[PDB]
Amino acid sequence: RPAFCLEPPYAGPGKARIIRYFYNAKAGAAQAFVYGGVRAKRNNFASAADALAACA
């Protein structure tokens, strides 16, 4: 799998409250986190299905 799939989630400095998904390779799962709306990293998906498609 791509290296970015190993990143922990990055909320960023923004104050928005947007649910996004990251791939947790240790758990083999797509997991929800709250994203602040700015400075997204690569392991940041709109849905669990998208995270799994890229990283599973």
Coordinates of all heavy atoms in Angstrom, one line a residue, unseen atoms left out:
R1 N 0.8 -1.2 0.0 CA 0.0 0.0 0.0 C 0.9 1.3 0.0 O 2.0 1.3 0.5 CB -1.0 0.0 1.2 CG -0.4 0.1 2.6 CD -1.5 0.1 3.6 NE -2.4 -1.1 3.5 CZ -2.1 -2.3 4.1 NH1 -1.0 -2.4 4.8 NH2 -2.9 -3.3 4.0
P2 N 0.3 2.4 -0.5 CA 1.0 3.7 -0.5 C 1.5 4.1 0.8 O 0.7 4.0 1.8 CB 0.0 4.7 -1.1 CG -1.1 3.9 -1.7 CD -1.1 2.5 -1.1
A3 N 2.6 4.8 0.9 CA 3.2 5.2 2.2 C 2.3 6.1 3.0 O 2.2 6.1 4.2 CB 4.6 5.9 1.9
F4 N 1.5 7.0 2.3 CA 0.7 7.9 3.0 C -0.4 7.2 3.8 O -0.9 7.8 4.8 CB 0.0 9.0 2.0 CG -1.1 8.5 1.2 CD1 -2.4 8.4 1.8 CD2 -1.0 8.1 -0.1 CE1 -3.5 8.0 1.1 CE2 -2.1 7.7 -0.8 CZ -3.3 7.6 -0.2
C5 N -0.7 6.0 3.5 CA -1.7 5.2 4.2 C -1.3 4.9 5.6 O -2.1 4.4 6.4 CB -2.0 3.9 3.5 SG -2.7 4.1 1.8
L6 N 0.0 5.1 5.9 CA 0.5 5.0 7.3 C 0.5 6.2 8.1 O 0.8 6.2 9.3 CB 2.0 4.5 7.2 CG 2.2 3.1 6.5 CD1 3.7 2.8 6.5 CD2 1.4 2.0 7.2
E7 N 0.0 7.4 7.6 CA 0.0 8.6 8.3 C -1.2 8.5 9.3 O -2.2 8.0 9.0 CB -0.4 9.8 7.4 CG 0.6 10.2 6.4 CD 0.1 11.2 5.4 OE1 -1.1 11.6 5.4 OE2 0.9 11.6 4.5
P8 N -0.9 9.1 10.5 CA -2.0 9.3 11.5 C -2.9 10.4 10.9 O -2.4 11.2 10.1 CB -1.3 9.7 12.8 CG -0.1 10.4 12.3 CD 0.3 9.6 11.1
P9 N -4.1 10.6 11.4 CA -5.0 11.6 10.9 C -4.5 13.0 11.3 O -3.9 13.2 12.4 CB -6.3 11.3 11.6 CG -6.0 10.6 12.9 CD -4.8 9.7 12.5
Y10 N -4.7 14.0 10.4 CA -4.3 15.3 10.6 C -5.5 16.3 10.6 O -6.0 16.6 9.6 CB -3.2 15.7 9.6 CG -2.7 17.1 9.8 CD1 -1.8 17.3 10.9 CD2 -3.0 18.1 8.9 CE1 -1.2 18.6 11.1 CE2 -2.4 19.4 9.1 CZ -1.6 19.6 10.2 OH -1.0 20.9 10.4
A11 N -5.9 16.7 11.8 CA -7.0 17.6 11.9 C -6.7 19.0 11.3 O -7.6 19.6 10.7 CB -7.4 17.8 13.4
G12 N -5.5 19.4 11.4 CA -5.1 20.7 11.0 C -5.5 21.8 11.9 O -6.1 21.6 12.9
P13 N -5.1 23.1 11.6 CA -5.4 24.2 12.5 C -6.7 24.9 12.3 O -7.1 25.8 13.1 CB -4.3 25.2 12.0 CG -4.2 25.0 10.6 CD -4.4 23.5 10.4
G14 N -7.5 24.4 11.4 CA -8.8 25.0 11.1 C -9.9 24.8 12.2 O -9.8 23.8 12.9
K15 N -10.9 25.6 12.2 CA -12.0 25.5 13.2 C -13.2 24.8 12.7 O -14.2 24.7 13.5 CB -12.2 26.8 13.9 CG -11.2 27.2 14.9 CD -11.4 28.5 15.6
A16 N -13.3 24.3 11.4 CA -14.4 23.6 11.0 C -14.5 22.2 11.7 O -13.6 21.8 12.3 CB -14.4 23.4 9.4
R17 N -15.7 21.6 11.5 CA -16.0 20.4 12.2 C -16.5 19.4 11.2 O -17.7 19.1 11.1 CB -16.9 20.5 13.4 CG -16.2 21.3 14.5
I18 N -15.6 18.9 10.3 CA -15.9 18.0 9.2 C -15.5 16.6 9.5 O -14.3 16.4 9.7 CB -15.3 18.5 7.9 CG1 -15.6 20.0 7.7 CG2 -15.7 17.7 6.7 CD1 -14.7 20.7 6.7
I19 N -16.4 15.7 9.5 CA -16.0 14.3 9.6 C -15.3 13.8 8.3 O -15.8 14.0 7.2 CB -17.1 13.4 10.0 CG1 -17.5 13.7 11.4 CG2 -16.7 11.9 9.9 CD1 -18.6 12.9 12.0
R20 N -14.1 13.3 8.4 CA -13.3 12.7 7.4 C -12.9 11.3 7.8 O -13.0 11.0 9.0 CB -12.2 13.6 6.9 CG -12.6 14.9 6.3 CD -13.2 14.8 4.9 NE -13.5 16.0 4.3 CZ -12.7 16.9 3.8 NH1 -11.4 16.6 3.7 NH2 -13.1 18.0 3.3
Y21 N -12.3 10.6 6.9 CA -11.8 9.2 7.1 C -10.3 9.1 6.9 O -9.8 9.6 5.9 CB -12.6 8.2 6.4 CG -14.0 8.0 7.0 CD1 -15.0 8.9 6.7 CD2 -14.2 7.0 7.9 CE1 -16.2 8.7 7.4 CE2 -15.4 6.8 8.6 CZ -16.4 7.7 8.3 OH -17.6 7.6 8.9
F22 N -9.6 8.4 7.7 CA -8.2 8.0 7.4 C -8.2 6.5 7.4 O -8.9 5.8 8.1 CB -7.2 8.6 8.4 CG -7.2 8.0 9.7 CD1 -6.1 7.1 10.0 CD2 -8.1 8.3 10.7 CE1 -6.1 6.5 11.3 CE2 -8.0 7.7 12.0 CZ -7.0 6.8 12.3
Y23 N -7.2 5.9 6.7 CA -6.9 4.5 6.8 C -5.9 4.2 8.0 O -4.8 4.7 8.0 CB -6.3 3.9 5.5 CG -6.2 2.4 5.5 CD1 -7.3 1.6 5.4 CD2 -4.9 1.9 5.7 CE1 -7.2 0.2 5.5 CE2 -4.8 0.5 5.7 CZ -5.9 -0.3 5.6 OH -5.8 -1.7 5.6
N24 N -6.4 3.4 8.9 CA -5.6 2.9 10.0 C -5.1 1.5 9.6 O -5.8 0.5 9.7 CB -6.5 2.8 11.3 CG -5.8 2.3 12.5 OD1 -4.7 1.7 12.4 ND2 -6.4 2.5 13.7
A25 N -3.8 1.5 9.2 CA -3.2 0.2 8.7 C -3.0 -0.8 9.8 O -3.1 -2.0 9.5 CB -1.9 0.5 7.9
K26 N -2.8 -0.3 11.0 CA -2.6 -1.2 12.1 C -3.9 -2.0 12.4 O -3.8 -3.2 12.7 CB -2.2 -0.4 13.4
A27 N -5.0 -1.4 12.3 CA -6.3 -2.0 12.5 C -6.9 -2.6 11.2 O -7.8 -3.4 11.3 CB -7.3 -1.0 13.1
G28 N -6.3 -2.2 10.1 CA -6.9 -2.6 8.8 C -8.3 -2.0 8.6 O -9.2 -2.7 8.1
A29 N -8.5 -0.8 9.0 CA -9.8 -0.2 9.0 C -9.8 1.3 8.6 O -8.8 2.0 8.8 CB -10.4 -0.3 10.4
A30 N -10.9 1.8 8.0 CA -11.1 3.2 7.7 C -11.8 3.8 8.9 O -12.9 3.2 9.3 CB -11.9 3.3 6.5
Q31 N -11.3 4.8 9.5 CA -11.8 5.4 10.8 C -12.1 6.9 10.7 O -11.3 7.6 10.0 CB -10.7 5.1 11.9 CG -10.6 3.6 12.2 CD -9.7 3.4 13.4 OE1 -8.8 4.1 13.8 NE2 -10.1 2.3 14.1
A32 N -13.2 7.3 11.3 CA -13.6 8.7 11.3 C -12.7 9.6 12.1 O -12.3 9.1 13.2 CB -15.0 8.8 11.7
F33 N -12.4 10.8 11.7 CA -11.8 11.8 12.5 C -12.4 13.2 12.1 O -13.0 13.3 11.1 CB -10.2 11.8 12.4 CG -9.7 12.3 11.1 CD1 -9.2 13.6 11.0 CD2 -9.7 11.6 9.9 CE1 -8.7 14.1 9.8 CE2 -9.2 12.1 8.7 CZ -8.7 13.4 8.7
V34 N -12.2 14.1 13.0 CA -12.7 15.5 12.7 C -11.5 16.3 12.1 O -10.5 16.5 12.7 CB -13.3 16.2 13.9 CG1 -13.8 17.5 13.6 CG2 -14.4 15.3 14.6
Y35 N -11.8 16.8 10.9 CA -10.9 17.7 10.1 C -11.4 19.1 10.2 O -12.6 19.5 10.2 CB -10.9 17.2 8.6 CG -10.2 18.1 7.7 CD1 -8.9 18.5 7.8 CD2 -10.9 18.5 6.5 CE1 -8.2 19.3 6.9 CE2 -10.2 19.3 5.6 CZ -8.9 19.7 5.8 OH -8.3 20.5 4.9
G36 N -10.4 20.0 10.4 CA -10.7 21.5 10.6 C -10.9 22.3 9.4 O -11.1 23.5 9.5
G37 N -10.8 21.7 8.2 CA -11.1 22.4 7.0 C -10.0 22.9 6.1 O -10.2 23.3 5.0
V38 N -8.8 22.9 6.7 CA -7.6 23.5 6.0 C -6.3 22.6 6.3 O -6.2 22.0 7.3 CB -7.2 25.0 6.4 CG1 -8.3 25.9 5.9 CG2 -7.0 25.1 7.9
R39 N -5.5 22.6 5.3 CA -4.2 21.9 5.3 C -4.3 20.4 5.4 O -3.4 19.7 6.0 CB -3.3 22.5 6.5 CG -3.2 24.0 6.5
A40 N -5.3 19.8 4.8 CA -5.4 18.4 4.7 C -4.2 17.7 4.2 O -3.5 18.2 3.3 CB -6.5 18.0 3.8
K41 N -3.8 16.6 4.9 CA -2.8 15.7 4.4 C -3.4 14.6 3.5 O -4.6 14.6 3.2 CB -2.0 15.1 5.6 CG -1.1 16.2 6.3 CD -0.2 15.6 7.3 CE 0.5 16.7 8.1 NZ 1.3 17.6 7.2
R42 N -2.5 13.7 3.0 CA -3.0 12.7 2.1 C -4.0 11.7 2.6 O -4.9 11.2 1.9 CB -1.8 12.0 1.4 CG -1.0 13.0 0.5 CD 0.3 12.4 0.0 NE 1.2 13.3 -0.7 CZ 2.0 14.1 -0.1 NH1 2.1 14.2 1.2 NH2 2.8 14.9 -0.9
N43 N -3.8 11.2 3.9 CA -4.6 10.2 4.5 C -5.9 10.9 5.0 O -6.1 10.9 6.3 CB -3.8 9.4 5.5 CG -4.5 8.1 5.8 OD1 -5.5 7.7 5.2 ND2 -3.9 7.4 6.8
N44 N -6.7 11.4 4.1 CA -7.9 12.2 4.5 C -8.9 12.0 3.3 O -8.7 12.5 2.2 CB -7.5 13.7 4.6 CG -8.6 14.6 5.0 OD1 -9.8 14.4 4.5 ND2 -8.3 15.6 5.7
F45 N -10.0 11.3 3.6 CA -10.9 10.9 2.6 C -12.3 11.3 3.0 O -12.7 11.5 4.2 CB -10.9 9.4 2.4 CG -9.6 8.9 1.9 CD1 -8.5 8.5 2.8 CD2 -9.4 8.8 0.5 CE1 -7.3 8.1 2.2 CE2 -8.2 8.3 0.0 CZ -7.1 8.0 0.9
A46 N -13.2 11.5 2.0 CA -14.5 11.9 2.2 C -15.4 10.8 2.9 O -16.4 11.1 3.5 CB -15.2 12.5 1.0
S47 N -15.0 9.6 2.6 CA -15.8 8.4 3.1 C -14.9 7.3 3.5 O -13.7 7.2 3.0 CB -16.7 8.0 2.0 OG -16.0 7.4 0.9
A48 N -15.4 6.3 4.2 CA -14.7 5.1 4.6 C -14.4 4.3 3.3 O -13.2 3.8 3.1 CB -15.4 4.2 5.5
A49 N -15.3 4.2 2.4 CA -15.1 3.5 1.1 C -13.9 4.1 0.3 O -13.2 3.3 -0.2 CB -16.4 3.5 0.3
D50 N -13.8 5.4 0.3 CA -12.7 6.0 -0.4 C -11.3 5.7 0.2 O -10.4 5.4 -0.5 CB -12.8 7.5 -0.5 CG -13.9 8.0 -1.5 OD1 -14.5 7.2 -2.2 OD2 -14.1 9.2 -1.6
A51 N -11.3 5.7 1.5 CA -10.1 5.3 2.3 C -9.7 3.9 2.0 O -8.5 3.6 1.8 CB -10.2 5.6 3.8
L52 N -10.7 3.0 2.0 CA -10.4 1.6 1.8 C -10.0 1.3 0.3 O -9.0 0.6 0.1 CB -11.6 0.7 2.1 CG -12.0 0.7 3.6 CD1 -13.4 0.1 3.8 CD2 -10.9 0.0 4.4
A53 N -10.6 2.0 -0.6 CA -10.2 1.8 -2.0 C -8.8 2.2 -2.3 O -8.0 1.5 -3.0 CB -11.1 2.6 -2.9
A54 N -8.3 3.3 -1.6 CA -6.9 3.8 -1.8 C -5.9 2.9 -1.1 O -4.8 2.7 -1.6 CB -6.8 5.2 -1.4
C55 N -6.3 2.5 0.1 CA -5.3 1.9 1.0 C -5.4 0.5 1.5 O -4.5 -0.1 2.0 CB -5.3 2.8 2.3 SG -4.7 4.5 2.1
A56 N -6.6 -0.1 1.3 CA -6.9 -1.5 1.9 C -6.0 -2.6 1.4 O -5.5 -3.4 2.2 CB -8.3 -1.8 1.8

